[PDB]
Design a protein around this ligand. Structure first.
Ligand SMILES: [Cl-]
Lengths: 259, 259, 259, 259, 259, 259
């Protein structure tokens, strides 16, 4: 069923729960192959009669450190690759928003940028109190164009959304729950157990009621689709600008950027 | 003025406050007459020159347990009745959203389903810290189509909205106020006193200023009217499916549903 | 010479392209006719000024603004041509700020009321003193809350909290404002300006197009409620020639109002 | 039921068609009672199970010449009256957009201002080739705030809408059909027969299919409700300005207005 | 394309894919074709050998609409009805979300379920003597399978309501006059014209074309919730009495007697 | 007043009509100065108390041939220039949509791309029967991002919008009026006389009524602001692609493009 997504791990759980695991170098960074697979996996899951609920997590004590340096290098260096990556970033968000089956995220450690999209667009997000949530874009040197403009104002309100998206100050899981960015917060060691119970309970519930409830609520995000697409275009116009070269170098060299 | 709404209690307060009380068996369950009366009372109130403010509450330590089993039976069992009940559900929400006079809710004990609609669409909602707020639909086996999709994302943010609407985990009044679902939280024995003070202050205030302020704010909900109507359609298509028959049987038999 | 057309405002260069914009007038920085016009019209000039990267806006001393001056309110009520002029200024204060690409950081101490509050809360990052006093006062004065709240409060604090404060006119401390999402962050009064200064300087040293394009994209959410804002403003201004505002004002200028 | 609307003539037709006739002095001028009755009749029709379709027309060879001197002068000269009339103007539009039963208009001769609203918001509008369709507002000296901003762009497109609304050039029934403002155009003596056949065919069709089709389509107008309401406020702020006094004078005295 | 057995795929020149609806009985859409039409579009969008789709019926018919087999299942079986509904939803949404351009070549009848594809095509080439009929209200269900996402933005609301409510046949010539289709030619020039247009797109600047149509399609996406409301209402109609009579009347080639 | 706009001619007409004339080489091509001047002139006009209405036209037998080859070369060749030009393109559309004073366009000869923006976003557009209206972007090799996505669907409906925007087939002024793209069409020799009459009539009319009518109608375009900005970003991502290089070379060498 999932042969077309070789960078992703697909592990059956109980009662139609599918465990989807992000397992890659650099605390589950999202590189070119994973970026494509994450974009295009959701429609396949929605048509799979043996899956009722997706439970998504990173391998180990990390959800994702964000786009890999290889992903960013490809985007900066090649026009065709940049547009392909853009199409994938667009479709990750829209395919998730258009997925009728529910998604529960189990967020431990870092959850950044391209991986954070999945963590936060999950229907129910379970965050470690000590998770480290960072959108990351403005610190890298590009606009926050990969999901935040479709949802953050309707998660945390505009004042908190602007504070964290503009500054890229780290948000703990506990603080994320406090302001509404995530559904619930528990101790790190209880994140997977808690997310698993929630996923199993949805999987044994009334399926169309559940799916139709989340589909209806998702119209709120769909109404900000054009807003999201504008943000994405502006992010991608940034990848040929000078700031991102410094932002990326600063990341690679473990130092502060000097824009 | 209101002999045409026999299931509701109408009690004048001071300064143009109208007390509207839901008083029925099963902790103020909503049967066929009450469901009809709650839909259609609002336009009559808005045209009544002796009413300035509505203060809505249940009798005793309960707002409402929601639709009665017999109301649900009609929704499942009769084509014309189902459409009638759907139109009433539609118009409860839209007549409230289109009401220029302010409504204050005094929420004690359970507030569920069809009765929760009024509690939460009230302009100012006063919740007991120990109220029990439950949308209830997905546990019954139908989509949450009777109000939540017009408002919950804009009350609590999407992550909290999805958590409670999909799982139907009970929300206390205290937690509801923390996440923004209700306006204010006080101890159970202070709910009606607090609500009465707030209602009387509105009734003695500048009427057009108050009404025009809430009307303008209500544009936000009106923009999600189509979203709401889609949710309502999916809920009511659910009354034609197998899950609700199990969910209703389970509620009657005081046992877990086995979907 | 750049800002000579705005005589009521103080323009003081900070570090790294930060412009300090200071509201300094008698009566805890009350806003008179010149200042109301200058606050409306300054923003496009700032956006085109290549030497400004970030605006840090504050009142002089322990106040952001106490409200509109006697003279401003008197022209609003007493003269048709002047009233429409003031309405245009009120409209464009909100819309020019929502259309501003450069970031604005507000440092809110003491009272924040009227056009000053508009600026304080539409700032991209709002830093509130724990003991700031935030008041939307309109309905208490006898007019609709038409000067900004309808473009933003539901998407800051959710509808239940927005209706509560806008309909009751209860004072919101800076501490409570931060608890409910109205402002970005809260610190002790003596830390407000240092905190706001750090935040402003950090934005000014960051990746400029990334920051500006992020906030621009987020501001589409407020732009979508433009018509709702303009409805609220029209209703406020229809109120200015009604009997209620005479009593609400007469009362303020002289106890409970007797509407 | 219908006794509460004394200015309106209600005449049953065949198959559940209700004829609603506007019959008053000055080619069916709308006076204060008629303006109120037209606003408030629609919800009563929707609840009457003996009515399936409304066929609305003027008496004789005129739909309506628009507001009577009394109605216009009240709006200029009295605060309370102006607000009442504004409420009615608002609710004529919104109650029609929210009506599930179909309305067919039979438009002969003049259709102006306040009675034009019903003619054009009818689901099916049958225009005499020689009807004279005049929004009229800018020529009276006030904004076109009584319906056109909820619908004209989605009838004729924006360039045609602005042309006729800004200039107030008369639109013939024939030209109205050419550009899409009305559904069909026939000779004057065929208008009532054609409208009657269409109304009777709707009345004999599949009722919920028809009602739900038009309800769904009406969501498009509802999404421009806030745009409509801001137009309405601007119109009503104009009734306090100097131009309308000259506009009313010029209308009554068959001279070109000299603004 | 092996997964879409009911569709004919004929490669053309320059990356034009001809997609032909070919079934016995004027290309009625049966169960298999209804599923295939829903799900084919995302596969086309990912196929690097296809640049443009030219969609047509076999012979002098685009499609007579849903087959009797298809309507019977929809009426007769809950699980089937929900499946068919999902397909009806996804036909529209997958077409609206397709980046590659679609040219329709419309000859003879274009009805209901096959009319969806004809009119949601980016460029629609209609025979002057095509017969365009939405068909739903005459069958006895709401027009819920596409028209509410687009007709008001094609022909304006007055023409949209006229044809959707009455189901009067619209010729291709009149359809072009009112803006429902892009262009009109004689029957024998339809396929040549459509082919020339498709090849010109296929030889054009690809991303420019795709991004132009994608951007324009945001207008339809904004009415997604309106479309989904219409679809639910249609599907609630399929278990009502009217459709049984409409279907019977079509079989027997007599007028329906609904009321 | 207008010292800041050197590429534009500003000539007083009668009664507060300002004649704004585009006069430059190559049939009024838009170079870098004129591109910035056209973007930024509108807010200055709105504040100029001596101007009531703008009448915009080209010098001689052309409105504008659109962007000059130097303007397009800078967009392709320089990152900082490209971003500047994008800002100007954005602000031309938004500043025009946000202008309260009415604009009448007198369209003779070609009106293409960047010059076509002003011609079609004018409130009243008067087209020569033999004007040549060409959006032109897809033929150049970039998306139609400079205005069409904010308005064409609401002018001509989606079928006609897609036809002309995807193909870049020329549209005559006569055909443009038939489909609703422009307000009115007269023969070439009558364009300036007709536009002058209309502009003078507006300038002698009820000023606030006129301005508030067009402002309210412009909310329809504002609601598609995000859609417009998306299209603009996609156009500008096009300028670093291979197609536009070929499209520009094709134009220069007066030949067909070979993408
Ligand atoms: Cl990233």
């Amino acid at each position: 069923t999932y042969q077309d997504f070789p960078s992703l791990r697909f592990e059956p759980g109980e009662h139609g729960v599918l465990n989807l695991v992000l397992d890659s170098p650099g605390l589950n960074s999202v590189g070119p192959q994973m970026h494509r697979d994450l974009a295009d996996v959701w429609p396949v899951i929605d048509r799979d009669p043996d899956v009722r609920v997706v439970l998504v997590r990173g391998e180990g004590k990390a959800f994702s450190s964000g786009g890999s340096f290889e992903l960013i290098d490809e985007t900066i260096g090649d026009y065709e690759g940049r547009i392909r990556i853009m199409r994938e970033a667009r479709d990750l968000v829209l395919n998730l928003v258009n997925l009728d089956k529910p998604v529960v995220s189990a967020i431990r450690g870092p959850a950044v940028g391209a991986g954070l999209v999945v963590a936060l667009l999950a229907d129910i997000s379970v965050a470690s109190a000590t998770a480290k949530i960072i959108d990351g874009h403005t610190k890298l040197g590009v606009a926050a164009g990969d999901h935040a403009a479709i949802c953050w104002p309707l998660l945390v309100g505009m004042a908190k959304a602007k504070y964290y998206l503009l500054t890229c100050e780290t948000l703990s899981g506990e603080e994320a729950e406090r302001i509404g960015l995530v559904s619930t917060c528990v101790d790190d060691d209880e994140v997977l157990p808690t997310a698993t119970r929630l996923a199993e309970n949805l999987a044994q519930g009334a399926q169309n009621a559940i799916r139709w409830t989340k589909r209806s609520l998702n119209h709120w995000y769909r109404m900000f689709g054009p807003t999201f697409e504008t943000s994405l275009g502006l992010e991608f116009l940034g990848f040929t600008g000078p700031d991102v070269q410094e932002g990326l170098a600063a990341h690679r060299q473990k130092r502060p950027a000097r824009f």
